[PDB]
A and B are shown apart, each in its own frame.
With several copies, the nearest count.
Chain A
Amino acid sequence: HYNVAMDIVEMLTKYKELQDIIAVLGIDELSEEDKLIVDRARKVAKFMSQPFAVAEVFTGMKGYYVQLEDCVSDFGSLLMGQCDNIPEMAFYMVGGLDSVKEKAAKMAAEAAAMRERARKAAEAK
C-alpha cells in the first residue's frame, strides 16, 4: 500500500512536469517510455474519480463502495501496466476494477454501433 501510494505520488509529480513540456513542445517530443507513464498517470487521475450516493441528484448515477483490497489490486495493476490495453475513459467516474472492463466492453459496443450505423448510412446514401 505504502509503495504504491508513493509511486503514484512520484508519477503524478512527473505528470505535472510533463504537462509543463506537452504544453510547449507536444507529445511527439517524448520517448515511448515517457508516453507510457504519461498514460498511466492520466489513467490514475481519471480512475481516482468516483460517484457518491449523495450525488445521485447531480450525477444521476449510483454511488459505489470500494473495498481496500480491490482499491489496491487496481492501482498496482495500473501502476505496473497490467491493464494498459483497457482504454482511458473506461476509468472515468467508476468504482472498482470490475466496473472498468464492463464500461470498456460497453464503449466498444456503442462504438461498433455507431460504426455500423455509419456504414448503413453510406450504403443508403
Chain B
Amino acid sequence: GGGTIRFWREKLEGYKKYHQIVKTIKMVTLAKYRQTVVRTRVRDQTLRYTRKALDAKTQDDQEVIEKSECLLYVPITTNRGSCGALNTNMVRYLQEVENPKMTIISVGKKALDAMTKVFQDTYRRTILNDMKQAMSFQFAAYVLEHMNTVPWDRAQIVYNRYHGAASQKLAIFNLPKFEDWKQKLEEDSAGDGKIEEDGLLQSLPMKTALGELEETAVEDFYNFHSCLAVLNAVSENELSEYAARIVAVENQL
C-alpha cells in the first residue's frame, strides 16, 4: 500500500495547506469587512427623499412590456468569488423574468462568462471596479454614461440587500425613463394628490415645484438622484459580498 499511503499523505498535506489558505481568505475578508461595517451604522439615509421621487406603485410586468419598447436590466455582480449563491440567484431571477425587449449591462467579472452564455444577444458588456479604492460618485456617473447609450424605457437595477449578517436578500430599483417620468409628474401634479398604493409617500408639492423648475435643472435632478441610487445599490451589494463571503468560507472550512 505504498502508493495508497502516499496518496493519502498527499491529500492530507494538501488539505492542511488548503485549510490555512482558506483561513487567509477569511482573515483578509474580515479585514475588508470591518472597514465596511462602519457604513451599517450610517446606513439607510441617502435615498430617504429620493424614494419620494423615483418610487411608484408596483406595476405588473405584462403591462410594462407592452407599454415599453426596449427595457433594461443592471445586475450588480462581483469581481471575486467564494461569495455564495448571490451571482447564481441573480441570474435565476433574470431568466425568471426574461423577455424579448430587454438588455443587460452588468457589473463585475462573474457576470461576464455567465451572461454571455445564458443571455446571448441581450447582454452587451459590463463594468469592472478593481476594489483597491471605494466606489465613487464619478463611477456611478460613468455607469450612467454607459446606460445612456441605450434608449431604455425602464431600467431595473438588481442587487443584494444586506438585511443582516445572516440574510442577504435580493433588491431592485425600478427606474422610469426621463421623458416618461416628466409626463407622469405633470399628470400627477394636475390631479389631487391621493396615494395609489399602500406605503407610498405623497409628493404633490414636489411634483408642483419640479414643474416650476427649469429644464436643465430637472435633467440634472434626475441624473443626480439616479446616480445616488446606483451608488447606494453598489455599496449595499459590496456589504452583502463581504457578509456572504464569510459564510461561504466558514462552510468551506
Chain A positions within 8 Å of B, measured between CB atoms, are 20-21, 24-29, 31-33
Contacts and interface: CB of A to CB of B under 8 A. Distances in A.
Nearest to B130: A28
* Chain B at the A interface: SS class: helix
B248 A32 contact: no
A20 B23 CA distance: 13
A28 B246 contact: no
What interface size band does chain B fall in?
Answer: 20 to 34
B165 interface: yes
B76 to A, nearest CB: 17
B114 interface: yes
Contacts of B114: 32
Contacts of B165: 25, 29
Interface of B: 17-18, 21-22, 25, 30, 37, 81-85, 87-88, 113-114, 117-118, 165, 246, 248, 251-252
Contact of B252 (A20, A25, A32): A25
12 contacts: A20-B21, A24-B18, A24-B21, A25-B82, A25-B165, A26-B37, A26-B84, A28-B85, A28-B248, A29-B165, A31-B113, A32-B114
A31 B83 CA distance: 15
Nearest to A33: B117
Closest 9 CB pairs of A and B: A24-B21, A32-B117, A28-B88, A28-B85, A20-B17, A25-B165, A29-B81, A32-B114, A24-B246
